[PDB]
Amino acid sequence: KYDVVIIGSGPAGMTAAMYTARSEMKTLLLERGVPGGQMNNTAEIENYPGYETIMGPELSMKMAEPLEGLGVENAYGFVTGIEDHGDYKKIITEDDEFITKSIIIATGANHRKLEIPGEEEYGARGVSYCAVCDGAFFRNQEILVIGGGDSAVEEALYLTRFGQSVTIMHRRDKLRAQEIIQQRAFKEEKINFIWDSVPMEIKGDDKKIQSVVYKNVKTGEVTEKAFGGIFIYVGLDPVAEFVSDLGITDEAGWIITDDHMRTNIPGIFAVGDVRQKDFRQITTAVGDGAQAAQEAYKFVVE
Amino acid sequence: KYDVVIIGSGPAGMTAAMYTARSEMKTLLLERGVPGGQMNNTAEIENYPGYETIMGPELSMKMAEPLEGLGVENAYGFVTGIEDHGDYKKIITEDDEFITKSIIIATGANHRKLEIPGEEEYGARGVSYCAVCDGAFFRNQEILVIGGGDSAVEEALYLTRFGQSVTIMHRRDKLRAQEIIQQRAFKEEKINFIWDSVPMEIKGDDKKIQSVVYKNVKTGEVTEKAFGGIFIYVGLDPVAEFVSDLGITDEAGWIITDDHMRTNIPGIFAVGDVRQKDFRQITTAVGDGAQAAQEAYKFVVE
Ligand SMILES: Cc1cc2nc3c(=O)[nH]c(=O)nc-3n(C[C@H](O)[C@H](O)[C@H](O)COP(=O)(O)OP(=O)(O)OC[C@H]3O[C@@H](n4cnc5c(N)ncnc54)[C@H](O)[C@@H]3O)c2cc1C
Ligand SMILES: Cc1cc2nc3c(=O)[nH]c(=O)nc-3n(C[C@H](O)[C@H](O)[C@H](O)COP(=O)(O)OP(=O)(O)OC[C@H]3O[C@@H](n4cnc5c(N)ncnc54)[C@H](O)[C@@H]3O)c2cc1C
C-alpha cells in the first residue's frame, strides 16, 4: 500500500511527510496525540530560523497546515509494533494495521516531570527542561537545576554563563555524572549544591517564579529559597516502545542510525529526538526529517 | 579575539551564528555579499517547515533580522585564507585579518548557469536548478532537463513523477552518468533524449516559458520545441577556494566533515551546501548550522 509511513507528527515527522508527499510518495502520517509533539508544550521559541519569536503551538499549526494539500494522509494511530516482511513492512496500531514499503520513525523523547505543584503553572514562566532553549532568559538570576546525572551537571555548567548563580539540587549525597563533568562542576565557583533534597513546590506570582520549597529526604527538613528559574533533569527517555525487539536501539532504547537516518533495517529510518544523538532541537529535527525523506524515496525507487 | 567566526551568511551560517551568539560565544559572521546566500536567487520556497510559502529574499530577511539583537557581530569580508595556529586560527580577508578560537565554514555552492537569453527572465517562471525544490510546480508538463551526468539523469528520473514527459538534452552523443543510473533512464519511457545539442534561448510570454530554441553542435541545425519548464545541471561547484590547501576537501573540492560537522582540523567545522554530502536544502543547512554551533561551543569550552 503506502510508499512510506511516518510515525509521529512532531517537527521531524511533519518535515519528513512534507517531503515525501511533495515528492509524490504515497504517504501516511500516524499520530497518537496532537500534531506538533513537544512543540505543543513549549511557549516562546527563539531559535527556529525564520521566526524571531514564535509560540510552540503556533509553530505546530504552521508546520501541520500544508500537509493535507501536499497529499499527506493524516491518520490516528498508537503504533504498538512493526513487522518486516522484506518487500514490505507491517505497522500495527491498537485497532489497525498498515502495509508500507518504508517507515520513518519520528516518535521523539520524553522529559520526566517533577509532578509538584507549580511546575505546570510556571512552565515557560521560569520552569524549563532545556538550557540551550531557555537559559538566555535568566541572565543574572539565581538559577536552580534539579538532577545529578550528566545532563543536570552539564546544563548547570552551561547555565552559569547566564545566571548569577546556579544551584544543583539532587536527591542523593553525591552525583552520578561522569567524573570529568563532575570535576568541571567542583571547579566552577558559581555552582553550589543542595544534597539529599527534592523540590516540593515551585512558587511565584501570577507572572513568574519567585521561590522553591524543598525537603531533605533524610531529615524531613523543609526550606524555601528564592530562585528566578528552574531547569529540570530527572530523566529523558526515548519514545520507541514499539521497536524494542527489532535490534535497532541502544542500551537506553535510543534508535541507532547512520548519518543518512538509516537504521540497520533496510527501509526503516528514524529521525529527530528518538535517535541516539546529542543535540535535540527543532532545527536538527527538521534537518533529520528532510534527510530521511530523501532516503526513503531512494529506497522505494530501487 | 572571537570565540567563533562563521564564514558565510546563508541559512547554514545564519543558524550557526544565531546559536553561538545565544550561547554567549563571542561571535563574528562574515559575508562578502547579501545575507541569505542562494535563498536570494530563489522565488517561492514551499518546503521550509513553518512557512507554507515564502519568497527566498523574504526568508533571508527573517533569518538575518534577529542576529544583531542576539549579539552576532556582522562584518563585511571576502575571505581568502585561513591559518591554523593551534590555540587560535587566523582568517585573512582581502583587506583584513581576524583571530578566533574556532571557525564554522558556511560558504555554500554554485549552480553553473547556461548564460543564454531567457534563463534569467524566466528564473522561477519555468527555469530551475533543483527538482526536489521545484518539480512539484510542473505536473503533467513537457519538461526539459539539461546535462548528461548523474545529477541531470537522476533529477530527470525524479521529474517524471510530475511531468507528462521529460527530455534530457546533452551536448555530447552519450552520457557521463553512472551505468546504473543510465540503465534506469533508458528503461523509463517518459524520458527521451536530444543529443549533441545545447539550448540557445528559452522563450515564453510575460508570465511563463513556452519554448526552448536549441542547436546541434555538430550540425549547426537549430530547433524550437514547446516546453513548460527547464531544469539545468551543467555543473555544481563548492564555493571554498580559501581552504584548498588545508587538506580538508575531497576531489571536487567539497569540504569533508564527520556527522558533527567537524573537519579534520580541530576547531574548524563546515556546514550546509559547502560540505561533501548528498542532500542540499535549507532544512539540512539549518540542521547543519545548529549542530556545528553546539560542537564549536564544546571545542571552545575544553
Ligand atoms: C518544554 C520544551 C521546550 C523546548 N524548546 C525548544 C526550543 O526553544 N527550540 C528548540 O529547538 N527545541 C526545543 N525543544 C526541543 C524540541 O521540542 C524537540 O527537539 C523536537 O520537538 C523533536 O521533534 P520530534 O519530531 O523528533 O519529536 P516530538 O516533537 O517529541 O514528537 C514526536 C511525536 O510522536 C508521537 N508518537 C510517539 N509515539 C508514538 C506511537 N507509538 N504512535 C504514534 N505516534 C507516536 C507523539 O505524540 C509526538 O507527537 C523543547 C522541548 C521541550 C520539552
Ligand atoms: C534557484 C534555487 C532555488 C532553491 N530552492 C530551494 C527550495 O525551494 N527549498 C530548499 O530547501 N532549498 C532550495 N535551494 C537550496 C538552498 O538555497 C541551499 O541549500 C541553501 O541556500 C544553502 O545554504 P548555505 O547556508 O550552506 O549556503 P548559501 O545559501 O550558498 O550561502 C553561502 C554564503 O556564503 C557567502 N560566502 C561565500 N564565500 C565567501 C567568502 N569567501 N567570504 C565571505 N562570504 C562568503 C556567500 O555570499 C553566500 O552568501 C535552492 C537553491 C537555488 C540556487
The C-alpha atoms of residue A267 and residue A5 are separated, in whole angstroms, by 10
Statement to judge: residues A29 and A103 lie in one domain: yes
Tell whether B87 and B126 lie within a shared domain: no
- Give the C-alpha separation, A221 to B3, whole Å: 45
Q: State how far residue B251 is from chain A, nearest Cα, in angstroms.
A: 21
Q: Which of A104, A199, A93 is nearest to A146 (CA)?
A: A199
Q: With contact defined as beta carbons under 8 Å apart, do A129 and A102 qualify?
A: no
CA gyration radius, chain A: 21
Do A242 and A227 belong to one domain? no
Can you read off the three cell numbers belonging to residue B66? Answer: 534577529
Q: In chain B, what is the straight-line distance between the N-terminal and C-terminal CA atoms, in Å?
A: 17
Q: Kindly state whether residues B243 and B106 are assigned to the same domain.
A: yes
* CA B176–ligand 2 middle distance (angstroms): 26
CA distance B129 to B231: 5
Closest residue in B to A58 (Cα–Cα): B50
Q: How far is the CA of B119 from the centre of ligand 2 (A)?
A: 19
Written as nine digits, the cell of A241 is 516502545
**In whole angstroms, what is the distance from residue B66 CA to residue B179 CA?**
48
Domain's final residue, options B177, B211, B235: B235
Our mutation pick for probing the ligand 1 site, out of A60, A282, A283, A291, counting the most ligand atoms within 8 A of Cβ, is A282
Q: Ligand 2 center to residue A143 CA distance, Å?
A: 39
On whether both B172 and B256 belong to a single domain, the answer is no
Angle among Cα A226, A227, A229 to the nearest 5 degrees reads: 165
- Cα dihedral: A50, A52, A53, A57 (round 10): -10
SS (H, E, C) chain B: CECEEEECCCHHHHHHHHHHHHCCCCEEEEECCCCCHHHHHCCEECCCCCCCCEEHHHHHHHHHCCCCCCCCEEEECCEEEEEECCCCEEEEECCEEEEECCEEECCCEEECCCCCCCCCCCECCCEECCHHHHHHHHCCCEEEEECCCHHHHHHHHHHCCCCCEEEEECCCCCCCCCHHHHHHHHHCCCEEEECCEEEEEEEECCCCEEEEEEEECCCCCEEEEECCEEEECCCEEECCHHHCCCCCECCCCCECCCCCCECCCCCEEECHHHECCCCCCHHHHHHHHHHHHHHHHHHHHC
- Candidate from B91, B128, B133, B277 with most ligand 2 atoms within 8 A of CB, to mutate: B133
Expressed in angstroms and rounded, the spacing between residue B152 Cα and the centre of ligand 2 is 20
A273 is catalytic: no
CA distance A140 to A32: 41
The structural domain count of chain A equals 2
**CB contact at 8 A, B212 and B198:** no
Q: What are phi and psi of B53, to 5 degrees?
A: -155, 140
Q: What's the reported resolution, in angstroms, to a tenth?
A: 2.0
CATH number (domain holding residue A153):
3.50.50.60
Residue A140: its H or E element: none
Ligand nearest to the CA of B34: 2
Closest alpha carbon to B221 in B185, B260, B195: B195
Domain edge (last residue) among B183, B209, B235: B235
What is d(CA B123, CA B103) in angstroms, rounded to the nearest whole number? Answer: 34
Q: Is the dihedral of CA B146, B152, B157, B158 positive or negative?
A: negative
Of A217, A235, A253, which residue sits at a domain end?
A235
Q: How far is CA B182 from CA A146, A299, B145, B153, in A?
A: 59, 18, 14, 7
Nearest CA to ligand 2 atom 22: B273
> Are B119 and B228 in a shared domain?
yes
Q: Which of A199, A289, A44 is nearest to B279 (CA)?
A: A289
A47–B18 CB contact, under 8 Å: yes
Ramachandran category for residue A115: left, alpha or beta (phi over 0 → left; psi -120 to 50 → alpha): left
Q: Tell me which of A3, A96, A134, A173 is the catalytic residue.
A: A134
Give me the count of residues in chain A. 302
Bridge partners, residue B192, by sequence: B167
Residue of B nearest to A59 (CA): B50
Task: Let me know: does B14 contact A50? Beta carbons within 8 Å.
Answer: no
Residues B204 and B243 in one domain: no
Give the number of residues written for chain B.
Answer: 302
Q: Are residues B47 and B91 in the same domain?
A: yes
Q: At what angle do helices B56-64 and B11-22 cross, to 10 degrees?
A: 20
Q: Which residues pair with B74 in a beta bridge?
A: B29
Instruction: Tell me which chain A residues have a C-beta less than 8 angstroms from the C-beta of B294.
Output: 132, 278-279
What grid cell was written down for A43?
511557549
- Residue A45 CA, chain-centre distance (Å), reads 14
Q: Which letter does DSSP use for residue A146 in this model?
A: E
Nearest residue on chain B to A136, alpha-carbon basis: B22
Vertex A66, ends A60 and A67: CA angle to 5°? 90
Chain A residues within 8 A of B283 when measuring between CB atoms: 15, 286-287, 289-290
| Interface of chain B toward chain A, CB-CB under 8 angstroms | 11, 14-15, 18-19, 22-24, 46-52, 59, 62-63, 65-66, 132, 136, 157-158, 161-162, 259, 278-279, 281, 283-284, 286-291, 294
Same domain (yes/no): A6, A99: yes
Q: How far apart are CA B67 and CA B85, in angstroms?
A: 29
DSSP 3-state of A3: strand
Nearest to B287 among A162, A283, A301 (CB): A283
Q: Are A183 and A170 in contact (CB under 8 A)?
A: no
Same domain assignment for residues A132 and A58: no
**Which of the listed residues B62, B79, B107 should we mutate to test ligand 2's pocket, taking the one with most ligand atoms within 8 A of CB?**
B107
Whether B196 and B273 map to the same domain: the answer is no
* Cell numbers linked to B231: 531544469
Size of interface A-B (CB pairs under 8 A): 104
Domain residues for B104?
A: 1-111+236-302
Amino acid at residue number A44: E
Same domain, A276 and A225: no
Q: For chain A, list residues whose CB is within 8 angstroms of any CB belonging to chain B.
A: 11, 14-15, 18-19, 22-24, 46-52, 54, 59, 62-63, 65-66, 132, 136, 158, 161-162, 259, 278-279, 281, 283-284, 286-291, 294, 301
CB neighbour list of residue A75: distance below 8 Å, 6 or more residues apart: A28, A29, A30, A31
For residue A285, give the chain B residue with the closest CA: B287
User: b/e string for A272-287 if b means 16 or more Cβ within 10 A?
Assistant: bbbbebebbbbbbbbb
Q: What does the DSSP assignment read for A156-219?
A: HHHHTTTSSEEEEE-SSSS--S-HHHHHHHHH-TTEEEE-SEEEEEEEE-SSSEEEEEEEETTT
Q: How far is CA A102 from CA A77, A208, A262, B47, in A?
A: 17, 46, 11, 21
How many Å apart are CA B287 and CA B294, to the nearest integer?
11
Distance B6 CA to ligand 2 centre (A): 14
What single DSSP character describes residue A123?
B
Method in brief:
X-ray
